[PDB]
Design a protein around this ligand. Structure first.
Ligand SMILES: Cc1ncc(COP(=O)(O)O)c(CN[C@@H](CS)C(=O)O)c1O
Ligand SMILES: Cc1ncc(COP(=O)(O)O)c(CN[C@@H](CS)C(=O)O)c1O
Ligand SMILES: [Cl-]
Ligand SMILES: [Cl-]
Lengths: 358, 358
């Protein structure tokens, strides 16, 4: 059989060099990096190389932290529940601004925060699909503790004007968090450009394992731990390190940035190939702006066919993709022109076969 | 070279069958268990078998939850920060009772809670080393929201009278949490016997990977999420599942309980062998009760030699162990009588060589 994987915004295959690099930490280098003896200290260089990889990947400096967490869901909960205690309670700033596009980790967390009496402005998205920047200017009051906007959208692939929000954020002395989960490996990421205080990411969107991620915290910026016990990660996040995943996610980030050109000019080309080949059907609208998207995503709709129906069918022919109803097709560097040609065929055939019904 | 590993209360080697069982989830079964297509659904049986393994390991029933988390540090933070919102705030019960023996995850979390104005009673430990039970009877007031006592101590190996506390807890209508991290694989565990509402554990203490653990939540018992986004784990803990680690930790628990006899009557025998062979030196006190300990741990002290000094030396001869100052030696089923004989030698030689100094 030959299955075709087009659901990379949901998760990604672990790159072989990633699996390879973590292996020794699953086999004989199983010591606790906190231990003082050989088993512990032996793990130190490999963890250090991994972290360097992380910092170079997001252009973070020595004075900043990139804290290892168990996923972006953790990072997101941590940023919001931390500003809550640090700013909303202790400092009166009882308002957070965010978008309606944000991943449920941020939105649900907020929903809980307003449960406790925080006022949260959920920015609505325009006809362009995206968020303006001026929208956050206009919403930042002076109770405003944090603004959270995701770098790229998981559903549409749309890039948001981070930097702009970065600047409108610096100028107004407000805390700025970007959930950058769908941007690693997909476009260049730079916390310095973005004047981010906080950035989230998750490894399994750039070919490392599920079960690990990162929060960039800028120097001097405080954030009350979500995992108290303050032993690991400079006391910022307690719990025995996930050695294998740390090493692996490091390699993952490195390869992710080293493929940024390829993502740009190959996967993007394959995406365009698929997309415009798909636009030659009936009422095959693409959903949203088509210029400010990550290279790998396309979100198409179809005449009278539910997205859910088209996907179930595509599965039968061993093609994997998600909703977004419309149909989200998200590539990676592992896809091939052969596959998308195949996809074009299987897509169109499914399309007109599902519509036959009067 | 031949290193001897005696630091199992710090972390454990991943059992080979564990590494083996997770492998396919690092290679071609990398789908998101939430996806609706083949890549996702394919992972379902293996996750289900893993969870069954977890439930059978702690004698939890169908109506209870065993929620996957990223470690015991997460579980501990989750129980305490959840009762805070559910009971302390929303319901007036502003008091938590716990021990001074507890792992810093629980103690630090509490320290933060009293920072917000919770009254936390830290129970002191007796000359016996342990906690009475009557001590928690006497401390449970009516603002009392939760009592948290660890099943077994990481430092001394001492078992606490869970069940007794279970009963004193049922009777007084108080929420009962046991951190059981050092009890899995070491003695039988039973939430039913223990009348636990909450139980924490971490895989890397019973030969699975660092970076995963569990919280048992009893049916009908609520606990406000620590990871909001409510998609995975019945909305109780959001974040993409850590597929490989889940499968592995399942196998880990299974093998852990299947070795409970061996832990009892082999590793315990090896521990006794080491311990009484070590008691034949000078002022080689063992620290604490010696009857109510898990089979694998011994915590010995020495005349005038600092523990830290003895450990540094032991490392040079490739023997790994921790402090607890005194000296904690924690075995696993992977140790061998050959090793402990060797240890006896290397220990005594180090002892009298470090003391030579006038
Ligand atoms: C922007 C963003 N932020 C957070 C997450 C979740 O990360 P975790 O590693 O699961 O915690 C995701 C992943 N959303 C996937 C799976 S639910 C999708 O199908 O769109 C994301 O895209
Ligand atoms: C009772 C108990 N509770 C929690 C933990 C920490 O679990 P994590 O998986 O790191 O979150 C531990 C592990 N304490 C180790 C390493 S710090 C020791 O050397 O004693 C524990 O023993
Ligand atoms: Cl918190
Ligand atoms: Cl919480």
């Amino acid at each position: 059989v030959q299955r075709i994987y087009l659901d990379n915004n949901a998760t990604t295959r672990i790159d072989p060099k990633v699996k390879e690099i973590m292996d020794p930490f699953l086999r004989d280098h199983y010591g606790n990096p906190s231990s003082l003896h050989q088993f512990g200290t032996e793990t130190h260089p490999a963890i250090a190389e991994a972290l360097d990889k992380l910092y170079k990947g997001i252009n973070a400096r020595d004075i900043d932290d990139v804290i290892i967490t168990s996923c972006a869901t953790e990072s997101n909960n941590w940023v919001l529940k931390g500003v809550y205690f640090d700013e909303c309670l202790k400092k009166g700033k009882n308002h957070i601004v965010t978008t309606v596009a944000e991943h449920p980790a941020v939105r649900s967390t907020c929903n809980f925060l307003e449960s406790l009496g925080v006022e949260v402005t959920y920015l609505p998205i325009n006809e362009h699909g995206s968020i303006t920047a001026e929208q956050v200017r206009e919403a930042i009051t002076e109770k405003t503790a944090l603004v959270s906007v995701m770098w790229a959208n998981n559903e549409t692939g749309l890039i948001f004007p981070i930097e702009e929000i970065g600047a409108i954020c610096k100028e107004k002395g407000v805390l700025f968090h970007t959930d950058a989960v769908q941007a690693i490996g997909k476009i260049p990421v730079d916390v310095l450009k973005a004047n981010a205080d906080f950035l989230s990411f998750s490894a399994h969107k750039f070919h490392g394992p599920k079960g690990i991620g990162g929060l960039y915290i800028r120097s001097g910026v405080g954030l009350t731990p979500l995992f108290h016990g303050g032993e690991h990660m400079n006391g910022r996040r307690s719990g025995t390190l996930n050695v294998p995943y740390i090493v692996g996610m490091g390699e993952a980030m490195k390869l992710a940035v080293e493929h940024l050109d390829y993502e740009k000019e190959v996967v993007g080309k394959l995406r365009d190939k698929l997309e415009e080949a798909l636009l030659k059907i009936p009422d095959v609208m693409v959903v949203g702006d088509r210029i400010h998207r990550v290279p790998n995503t396309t979100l198409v709709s179809v005449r009278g066919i539910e997205g859910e129906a088209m996907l179930w069918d595509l599965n039968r022919s061993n093609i994997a993709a998600s909703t977004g109803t419309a149909i989200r097709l998200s590539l990676s560097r592992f896809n091939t022109e052969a596959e998308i040609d195949k996809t074009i065929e299987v897509f169109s055939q499914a399309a007109v076969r599902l519509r036959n019904i009067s």
